[PDB]
Amino acid sequence: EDIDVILKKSTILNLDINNDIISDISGFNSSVITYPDAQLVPGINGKAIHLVNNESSEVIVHKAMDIEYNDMFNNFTVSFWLRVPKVSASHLEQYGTNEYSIISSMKKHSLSIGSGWSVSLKGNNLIWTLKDSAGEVRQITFRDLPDKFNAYLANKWVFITITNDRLSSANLYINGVLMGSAEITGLGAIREDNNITLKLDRCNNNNQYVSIDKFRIFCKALNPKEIEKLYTSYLSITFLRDFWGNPLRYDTEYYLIPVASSSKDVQLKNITDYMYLTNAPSYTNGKLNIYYRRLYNGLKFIIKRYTPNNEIDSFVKSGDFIKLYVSYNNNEHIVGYPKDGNAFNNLDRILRVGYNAPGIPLYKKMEAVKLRDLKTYSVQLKLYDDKNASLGLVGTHNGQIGNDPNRDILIASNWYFNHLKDKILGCDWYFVPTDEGWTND
Numbered sequence: 176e177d178i179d180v181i182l183k184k185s186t187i188l189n190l191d192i193n194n195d196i197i198s199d200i201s202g203f204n205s206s207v208i209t210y211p212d213a214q215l216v217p218g219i220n221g222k223a224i225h226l227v228n229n230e231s232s233e234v235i236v237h238k239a240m241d242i243e244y245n246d247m248f249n250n251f252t253v254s255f256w257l258r259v260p261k262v263s264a265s266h267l268e269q270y271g272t273n274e275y276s277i278i279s280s281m282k283k284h285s286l287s288i289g290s291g292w293s294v295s296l297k298g299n300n301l302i303w304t305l306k307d308s309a310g311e312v313r314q315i316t317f318r319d320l321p322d323k324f325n326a327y328l329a330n331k332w333v334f335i336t337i338t339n340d341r342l343s344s345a346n347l348y349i350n351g352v353l354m355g356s357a358e359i360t361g362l363g364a365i366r367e368d369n370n371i372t373l374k375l376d377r378c379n380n381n382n383q384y385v386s387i388d389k390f391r392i393f394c395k396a397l398n399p400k401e402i403e404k405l406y407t408s409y410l411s412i413t414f415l416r417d418f419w420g421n422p423l424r425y426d427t428e429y430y431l432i433p434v435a436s437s438s439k440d441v442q443l444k445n446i447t448d449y450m451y452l453t454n455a456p457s458y459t460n461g462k463l464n465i466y467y468r469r470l471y472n473g474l475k476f477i478i479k480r481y482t483p484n485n486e487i488d489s490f491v492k493s494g495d496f497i498k499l500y501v502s503y504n505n506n507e508h509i510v511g512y513p514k515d516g517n518a519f520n521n522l523d524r525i526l527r528v529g530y531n532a533p534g535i536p537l538y539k540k541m542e543a544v545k546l547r548d549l550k551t552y553s554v555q556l557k558l559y560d561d562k563n564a565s566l567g568l569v570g571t572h573n574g575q576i577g578n579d580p581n582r583d584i585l586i587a588s589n590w591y592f593n594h595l596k597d598k599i600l601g602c603d604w605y606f607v608p609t610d611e612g613w614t615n616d
């Protein structure tokens with residue numbers, strides 16, 4: 176059939192956030208009780224649920240009387256956007272074995288041993304548990320990647336999809352990719368609690384917090400194609416996104432990292448001069464089997480509206496014309512390309528920071544766009560002159576300026592426009608803002 180129709184008709188619960196209110200929009204109108212400390216934060220498309228570690232931080236969904244899908248052997252799928260901060264080395268050793276659930280249909284503290292199902296976290300493990308009324312439990316334990324820059328439980332919004340085919344297996348996917356599975360054939364009736372609880376339960380780390388968005392449940396075990404569609408469907412090209420998957424913002428400091436060479440940071444030669452790539456320092460921990468390129472080194476960039484048009488908003492949308500500045504010595508210097516400014520083969524125009532030569536035009540009108548790699552939280556920057564001509568997309572060129580060492584220098588080139596289909600390009604940028612969800616060990 177139509178994947179879109181199937182996806183829609185199979186939805187039996189779909190939490191949305193409108194006007195700061197969390198409710199079910201599936202149609203069965205499952206009642207939603209939002210406790211005092213359930214906070215709201217930027218989500219994948221609108222706002223999202225943010226949970227902290229205290230009794231008042233929870234959201235309870237009272238399943239409608241028409242929704243009891245976990246019937247004798249009946250299939251269901253759970254999907255949602257998840258964001259958990261990078262567990263620090265100390266906390267990993269500290270609370271690494273502390274399994275705490277974050278979403279459950281189980282009713283602990285009364286009876287019905289382990290009720291139905293749950294989504295729990297243990298150190299850097301994402302766990303799915305299914306338990307029937309006769310004891311029987313099944314699980315999928317996902318062990319995240321060592322490299323936290325590319326891990327899934329390390330401060331980036333990620334799409335979780337767990338399908339349950341009671342006639343075969345249960346499968347866990349992340350951003351549409353299968354990453355764990357378990358047989359679940361032969362389970363008895365799952366008699367869970369009438370409430371689905373969104374809450375950090377049994378977590379000993381008082382500082383722990385997670386973020387959940389678009390929590391949804393389907394009455395069928397989604398297949399790879401439907402999952403793949405559900406996933407990409409949430410990616411609205413409208414607003415741009417920063418490294419963590421949050422909406423990109425104006426007048427906010429961002430460190431830039433080129434997707435095509437993620438181990439690199441951006442440095443400035445001298446004010447009025449060019450920028451270039453640098454190897455970022457690393458953090459490695461063999462005992463905890465954790466490692467990642469550190470963040471927050473290099474130049475701080477700041478996006479500003481070229482001309483404060485129609486609205487005093489702070490969200491950057493694709494197509495917005497902007498001005499780029501780098502903060503060096505507390506002062507903000509504009510980023511651009513001077514007329515007839517030095518360039519590599521008159522193609523790759525070398526960018527400059529704080530260029531201020533008298534009588535020389537400095538082209539700095541830029542457009543923030545999203546022209547490719549929909550799944551990656553990356554942005555492209557298009558530079559124009561003053562006569563609406565494209566001076567190219569911001570990227571890098573590996574050359575030598577004067578007698579300086581051979582470097583990967585930031586430039587503006589139109590060559591990019593003829594390779595937008597490539598996997599890895601060079602004009603793709605990560606905008607990294609300092610976040611409490613990630614501090615270098």
Ligand SMILES: CC(=O)N[C@H]1[C@H]([C@H](O)[C@H](O)CO)O[C@@](O[C@H](CO)[C@@H](O)[C@@H]2O[C@@](O[C@H]3[C@@H](O)[C@@H](CO)O[C@H](O[C@H]4[C@H](O)[C@@H](O)[C@H](O)O[C@@H]4CO)[C@@H]3O)(C(=O)O)C[C@H](O)[C@H]2NC(C)=O)(C(=O)O)C[C@@H]1O
Pocket residue numbers: 444448449514515516517518525532535576577
């Ligand atoms: C259209 C146009 O005329 N603009 C030029 C500009 C322009 O002259 C300046 O912006 C005006 O201030 O210069 C461009 O090239 C510059 C050098 O002019 C770059 O190559 C940058 O050079 C740096 O170091 C040189 C400068 O300090 C110059 C100043 O004159 O002195 C040395 O170079 C020679 C000079 O070119 C000669 O005039 C002089 O007689 O002899 C010296 C040495 O024998 C320095 O090496 C600089 O400007 O700081 C170092 C920078 O890293 C370098 N930047 C780049 C991107 O290469 C320009 O791009 O601005 C060329 C442009 O067409």
